[PDB]
């Protein structure tokens, strides 16, 4: 039947205050989080950001949601999750995250009979990945993903991984939208950040990347080299042909100029010199020698 289950639900929400965390007086709430990266989105190098599509899972113990019926686990609808207390986990470095609403809110709620909740969401986090482009394009990055609680200090809501920290953040096999980089591995960690309001627990996850040097080789180095060779050919010409050697020199110098300009446009407007900048500077010097 379904009236026994309607009665169970109405008994659960009868006398429930969703403004109070579970165990407000004599307990610190323990949120066991977890992540399943369905697809590592494209690392935008211009904005120093990166997109990642996750199945963000959380699970706390609410003693005010104990029941006793025919079923053990109530796999409820995602609209019940708005009538109970759910931790306000926010991403410390996320820029513009979206929660999907197609076709219904991509959420889940499983209430175990002893109160153990489970609440998963499907997110698309656009986090910040500060990059030191001093080895461009032979650089390797560690893009972090820090998430913690808002409005709940460390004395109230503590976060913890649900499995061994090495096995919590899982990445799907086919989930790699990286065309330029190469995902090496994840690395999780848990710390405590001070603030002006209190001490908060912060869970961190670095995804180590490693840039692929194929596209930059093909489109900067080869053209640079070929231009140096094309400039170096002007020596085997005889000394009587001044027009030709002059054309060689001028054209090559201006091809190196336009190559430097076109090579610098791809990167962010950074204020130091990369490795590609040194290679292009040396080839420019060669054509001017």
């Amino acid at each position, epitope marked *: 039947n379904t009236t026994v289950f309607t009665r169970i639900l109405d008994r659960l929400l009868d006398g429930y205050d969703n403004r109070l965390r579970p165990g407000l007086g004599e307990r610190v709430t323990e949120v066991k989080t977890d992540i399943f990266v369905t697809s590592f989105g494209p690392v935008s190098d211009h904005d120093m950001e990166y997109t990642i599509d996750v199945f963000f899972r959380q699970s706390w113990k609410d003693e005010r949601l104990k029941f006793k019926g025919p079923m053990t686990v109530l796999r409820l609808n995602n609209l019940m999750a708005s009538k109970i207390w759910t931790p306000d986990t926010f991403f410390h470095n996320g820029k513009k995250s979206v929660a999907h609403n197609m076709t219904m809110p991509n959420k889940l709620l499983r209430i175990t009979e002893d109160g153990t909740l489970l609440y998963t969401m499907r997110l698309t986090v656009r986090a910040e990945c500060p990059m030191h482009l001093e080895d461009f394009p032979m650089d390797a990055h560690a893009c972090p993903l820090k998430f913690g609680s808002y409005a709940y200090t460390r004395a109230e809501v*503590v976060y*913890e*991984w649900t499995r*061994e*920290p090495a*096995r919590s953040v899982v990445v799907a096999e086919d989930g790699s939208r990286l065309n330029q980089y190469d995902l090496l591995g994840q*690395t*999780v960690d*848990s710390g405590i950040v001070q603030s002006s309001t209190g001490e908060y627990v912060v869970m961190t996850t670095h995804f180590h990347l490693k840039r692929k040097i194929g596209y930059f080789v093909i489109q900067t180095y080869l053209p640079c080299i070929m231009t140096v060779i094309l400039s170096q050919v002007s020596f085997w010409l005889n000394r009587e042909s001044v027009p030709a050697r002059t054309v060689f020199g001028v054209t090559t110098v201006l091809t190196m100029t336009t190559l430097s300009i076109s090579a610098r446009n791809s990167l962010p407007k950074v204020a130091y010199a990369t490795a590609m900048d040194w290679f292009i500077a040396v080839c420019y010097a060669f054509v001017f020698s």
Partner: antibody
Amino acid sequence: VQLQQSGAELVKPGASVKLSCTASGFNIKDTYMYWVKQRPEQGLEWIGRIDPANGDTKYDPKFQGKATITTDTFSNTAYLQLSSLTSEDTAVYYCARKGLRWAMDYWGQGTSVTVST
Amino acid sequence: NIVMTQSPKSMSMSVGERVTLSCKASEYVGTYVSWYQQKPEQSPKLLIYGASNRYTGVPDRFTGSGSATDFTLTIGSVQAEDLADYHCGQSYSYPTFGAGTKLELK
């Protein structure tokens, strides 16, 4: 809060011993339950853990098949059964629960098994 | 399998002096290194859960210091009941403990 292990066992080499660990003060469905061995005057060694909410048990690669870990949610007990034992595993077996930052805060007391004839 | 090389093997030190123990992990373990104090004929007791977090009931003379691989346990004014084994164990992966350091008085 209080983990009570079994008593000492005197088992013949080639038999199976089943050690029990009764947890009083909490529910085992909330945390994991680790089993540790310690030979005399040596370092601690991990055997395996069990998630009592599901039954997912992981073992140390050098203890796979030799040991098995089961649970009993009604009495809040963890059982460790040594399937086939030689005369070398005459160690002290501890039962611990995972703590706050994945440490093992509460340990048992140790059931010193003895293998001889 | 992450292995924890704990040093030194066995040290002897007098009362009231600062002492330090080192625990170097093979692979990366973020801050999931715990320090346990096992007195003879007793079960190990957790001292430092995570790196640099004293457990409830531990005197303030014990301090942890964490990193990615290297970890340190410093005891300050050492009393006469701190003569026990001191194991370091990571938990970032399946837990593996160190060999332990037999602290002695002389």
